Design a protein around this ligand. Structure first.
Ligand code: GNP
Ligand code: GNP
Lengths: 442, 451
């Protein structure tokens, strides 16, 4: 919002606790400090003093900190008033603070917003502030913090400076220059691949368990979860609603999706559930097939049920799992039929769940070989796509038409797209939309 | 566990926030100060420095305040660390802190005790302190029942039982070496020890895979079939979750969704409409929903406006009110107001919320959201609760290791019994208390010692 307008916001999560901290920043911070305290303590001093109400009655007691700019989180004069984790007194204090003219509850991201407006840090580091306050896995949290340290900004600045030097080479105008044009491409491709591996643990992937009713997909999902996830019984059509479960096999996220058994039933609800499952199959990154071993010995996908193979689009990895393999006595392990993985295991007994977990871990591109790395965003991937497209078009134009002006224009556009994440060229609308998603008071 | 113990705890409430506070009070305070920050900043100064680990990496960056006694909250060596309100990062930092020898996690409202008995806090509010401790302790006890609630609370049992059995066969032939019990005193004892160790790893590997905790406060929406439960859940979630139809008992399996409200997390629970079940699936789903109801935290009972104008929850369906736990807060959602036309808003009936809303269109949703946030949830939500279990089980494996190492030397059973007793004492913090008299009773019931 308005930079000149002083703002106040609650920092600590709502509820009750030992300390409820209020953060105020703006040009009215000193006047509000006098109004609520009647004095200005030494900056960066943990002073124990009471809080003063408008009528003069003691509002509360705590720790008051005064941080004159620019040696603060935002660079302006910021008052950090820590009291107690009492929401009622916090409400009264916030009302008193808002009473004074010139104060207003800043919109979410304003604390990051203004700090970004003063060029404290890279723009994408602002989003890096998020994705860490609310994570899902320990590995994801560590990667988000490492990114918050600011390595991605280093890589982006190096790439942009190399692109600027190449653009200069154009303006000023060897083979080594082409070798550099290609090795910068190689390093950018490697960093983009690592980023693709990044943000992969922000959601992991989607795996669809597909099979007929009276199969045990509900049971397999239940065993993977390790709790009582769903209802298991011999009644046909055991599950109708789409079931989603977020789990981590080993330091990695993933969403396992259950579905109703594929059969034609007069039930409208069952038909809707089948429709939902067929909708979700395409979105999923991977699909597994569960078929009873006793029902049919066929392992090729066509024999089991020729309809599903035809219906499912190609280019999607698929695996077949032989549930109830204990009754059949089949050797438990990993095999391949028609080029697709085939596992055997029994849900109720739990045998073969470990091999299923190992297959899920290994099949998806990931491993513990590389640590630290980086966590990226969809917008980052789109910007990388556009930059790579521009670079490829520029190189093709050079090779074929030898158009120096066209190559220079393509290189400049690619550099601008790459710097879009840095925010030098990004418009204010994108910054505002990104900052709005942040929680209030951040 | 003297009053001089240095304790580490979290001050900020659980959930999402921009700042997290960890406070340590005790003799080892300075030790922790040097262990985490690798130095001691200026006292009562807003120093700035990131948090480092043993490997040398950074776990968080924030503000550290060091307050030597007696001018502090508890009048002792107090350390305050402020960083980012991330549950995962907070858990990592707490795990880093706890590894130091002689440290332990604080009990419910221990800092109130420390700051009260040191005369650093006023004396008038004795009753207020008496309640502030009890409420936190009760909430902590209520938690940790979700920590040990799945397959994870299936190996530890095994473990403990195995240990008990071993102890029964190791202590007995130290107290009754005059009966005919054919004790296993031969070397095979160590063999029976090995499996116990091999069992513990399994437990330590059980919680490393599965669900993802998903801290928050539980809310349940329930009523009779076709009462708007699906519509209410879909509206609250903001995305389609369950099918919406007029068929009785459309949904048969419980559904769980997660939603944040201005930094306060909440978990919406959908269950099949309550009624008499003529099907195995329906009856089992009704039982599951009923069982989930008791463990819930907040409950919104469906009251269809079309069905009747009754407002009192007891009159609408007294049996559910009677079956409900007394402490369980209850709210009343008069569904289908848009058709009935009853004015939207917030009201009170016999002290319980009564809210008429239009679920089919979204009328009155903001009122329910306002009531939900205004309702409150102290601490001990999830991660910390399971940290206690992962710590108690942690400081038993080393005792078993050191006890087993003894057997390699002269076979002295007294030291083995001491180590096993210490290990079982540590394990008792998870399941329950196992006094010596219980071991004696099991020995009596297992053998024909008699007299
Ligand atoms: N012993 C054993 N039991 C199994 C095996 N596969 C499935 N079951 C049993 O199948 C029973 C019925 O579960 P059910 O509700 O049909 O699961 P479902 O997944 O809903 N069936 P469907 O996959 O067709 O949807 C469970 O109690 C489970 O123990 C197996 O390999 N071994
Ligand atoms: N006219 C009207 N209908 C409503 C309103 N709120 C909910 N409903 C109806 O309530 C019905 C509830 O049935 P359904 O969607 O199956 O969900 P449910 O309430 O969980 N029923 P069940 O327990 O049988 O699964 C919905 O189909 C919806 O049309 C409302 O405000 N007005």
């Amino acid at each position: 919002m308005s930079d000149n307008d002083t703002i106040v916001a609650q920092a600590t999560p709502p509820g009750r606790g030992g300390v409820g901290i209020l953060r105020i920043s703006g040009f009215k911070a000193r006047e509000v400090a006098e109004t609520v305290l009647g004095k200005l303590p030494k900056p960066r001093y943990a002073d124990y003093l009471p809080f003063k109400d408008a009528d003069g009655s003691v509002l509360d007691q705590g720790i008051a900190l005064w941080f004159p700019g620019p040696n603060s989180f935002t660079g302006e004069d910021v008052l950090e008033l820590q009291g107690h984790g009492g929401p009622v007194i916090l409400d009264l204090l916030l009302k008193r603070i808002l009473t004074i003219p010139g104060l207003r509850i800043a919109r979410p991201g304003e604390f990051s917003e203004r700090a970004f407006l003063n060029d404290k840090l890279d723009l994408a580091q602002a989003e890096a502030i998020a994705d860490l306050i609310d994570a899902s896995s320990e590995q994801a949290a560590r990667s988000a913090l490492n990114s918050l340290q600011g390595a991605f900004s280093a890589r982006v600045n190096h790439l942009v400076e190399a692109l600027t030097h190449l653009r200069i080479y154009v303006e000023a105008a060897d083979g080594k220059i082409e070798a550099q044009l290609n090795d910068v491409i190689a390093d950018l491709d490697a960093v983009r691949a690592e980023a693709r591996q990044g943000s992969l643990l922000r959601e992991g992937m989607k795996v669809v368990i597909a099979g007929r009713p009276n199969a045990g997909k509900s049971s397999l999902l239940n065993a993977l979860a390790g709790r009582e996830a769903a209802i298991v019984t011999d009644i046909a059509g055991t599950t109708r609603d789409v079931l989603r479960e977020h789990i981590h096999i080993d330091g990695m996220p993933l969403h396992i999706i259950d579905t109703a058994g594929l059969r034609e039933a007069s039930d409208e609800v069952e038909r809707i559930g089948i429709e939902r499952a067929w909708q979700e199959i395409e979105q999923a990154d991977r699909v597994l097939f569960m078929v009873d071993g006793t029902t049919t010995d066929a392992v090729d996908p066509a024999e089991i049920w020729p309809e599903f193979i035809a219906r499912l689009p190609a280019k999607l990895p698929i695996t077949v799992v032989r549930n109830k393999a204990d009754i059949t006595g089949e050797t438990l392990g990993m095999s391949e039929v028609n080029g697709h993985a085939l596992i055997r295991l029994s849900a109720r007994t739990g045998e073969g769940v470990d091999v299923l977990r190992n297959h899920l871990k290994q099949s998806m591109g990931f491993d513990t070989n590389m640590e630290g790395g980086f966590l990226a965003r969809r917008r980052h991937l789109q910007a990388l796509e556009q930059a790579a497209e521009h670079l490829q078009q520029g190189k093709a134009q050079l090779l074929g038409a030898w158009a120096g002006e066209l190559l220079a224009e393509e290189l400049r556009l690619a550099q601008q797209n790459l710097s879009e994440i840095t925010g030098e060229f990004t418009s204010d609308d994108l910054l505002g939309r990104i900052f709005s998603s942040f929680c209030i008071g951040k």
